[PDB]
Amino acid sequence: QPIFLNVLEAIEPGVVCAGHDNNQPDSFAALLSSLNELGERQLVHVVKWAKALPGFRNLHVDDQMAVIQYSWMGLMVFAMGWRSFTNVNSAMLYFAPDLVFNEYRMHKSRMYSQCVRMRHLSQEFGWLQITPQEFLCMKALLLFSIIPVDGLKNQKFFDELRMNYIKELDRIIASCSRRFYQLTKLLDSVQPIARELHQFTFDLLIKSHMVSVDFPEMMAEIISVQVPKILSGKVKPIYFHT
Amino acid sequence: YIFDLFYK
Ligand SMILES: C[C@]12CCC(=O)C[C@@H]1CC[C@@H]1[C@@H]2CC[C@]2(C)[C@@H](O)CC[C@@H]12
């Protein structure tokens, strides 16, 4: 009904395969090297997805590029959670068709806590009866949920943009605004996870030569350049709730 | 930056 909703649905990415060799035995390096590749693949789709976003061309270029490189973990995690929820009703983590984590893979990835945290998110989509329309909208907002504390180049267009996106999630909601609490609460809960995942990948990066884990070129840049800014507290998510 | 050349 909104143009807005129309758009989000129009531009929502398709399936992205990891390229994983499900014939070889589960193993940290095989698994994590496939996840990293999928990250990269998923990121090209996030850039294209983001550029076709309402208002997105508004922002300064460096602002566009920054916001993307700060928020990519969160978005990917969110939609991975939806993917899992809609395809395997949250029983397993559906990273891509060729990369589904069962508990064994959860443990082999050495990321178990985090995966369980992600499997929970997924279940929330269920327990809260999240609509495809709420999902799109929430995901949209997640691109505008992490900023450096020194603010952006055009902090004003950003704020405008972020304010409108909230107004839209509100519109597709509109006792009832308890739904808002819930959705904002769920949204807030993505960050802790993304942060946990950020430390994890960053270390993985540091020691990657010595565990034969393969980082794609652009992924190593981002993780070495933009991610530490987050981890050092220079870049912060915006929570709805203190 | 690879990301930046890519983005543009
Ligand atoms: C974003 C990805 C890749 C895409 C996805 O569906 C969610 C998933 C969450 C964990 C990330 C992973 C990309 C590669 C990472 C960053 C690994 O280095 C460690 C954690 C992985």
CB of A47 less than 8 A from some CB of B: yes
Return the number of other C-beta atoms located less than 10 Å from residue A105's C-beta: 19
Query: What's the length of chain B?
Result: 8
Return the number of other C-beta atoms located less than 10 Å from residue A92's C-beta: 18
Q: Measured over all CA atoms, what is the biggest interatomic distance in chain A, rounded to whole angstroms?
A: 54
Resolution in A: 2.8
- DSSP 8-state class, residue A57: G
Instruction: Point out which residues pair with A148 in neighbouring strands.
Output: A235
Contact A76 CB / ligand 1 (< 6 Å) = yes
Residue with tokens 């758009």: A7
| Residue A86 known to bind ligand | no
| Residue A36 known to bind ligand | yes
Residue pair A79/A139 in contact (Cβ under 8 Å)? The answer is yes
Query: What's the length of chain A?
Result: 242
Task: Calculate the dihedral angle through the C-alpha atoms of A213, A89, A10, A189, rounding to the nearest 10 degrees.
Answer: -70
- Rg, Å, chain B Cα set: 4
Residue pair A134/A183 in contact (Cβ under 8 Å)? The answer is yes
Contact A200 CB / ligand 1 (< 6 Å) = yes
Q: Which stretches within chain A are classed as H helix?
A: 3-10, 28-51, 61-88, 103-108, 112-127, 132-142, 155-171, 177-206, 217-225, 227-231
Residue pair A83/A139 in contact (Cβ under 8 Å)? The answer is no
| Residue A242 known to bind ligand | no
Closest CA relative to residue A224, chosen from A205, A210, A207? A205
Q: Which residues contact A111 (CB under 8 A, 6 or more apart)?
A: A197, A200
Query: By what technique were these coordinates determined?
Result: X-ray
- A222 contacts B7? CB cut-off 8 A: no
Range of the domain at A104: 1-242
CATH number of the domain encompassing residue A82: 1.10.565.10
Contact A201 CB / ligand 1 (< 6 Å) = yes
Instruction: Give the closest of B2, B4, B8 to A217, CB-based.
Output: B2
Helix (H) or strand (E) holding A96: strand A93-96
C-alpha A171 – ligand 1 centre gap (Å): 32
**Six-digit token string for A211:** 């565990």
Cα A64 → chain centroid: 16
- Domain count for chain A: 1
Ligand 1, residue A36: give the atom nearest the CA: 14
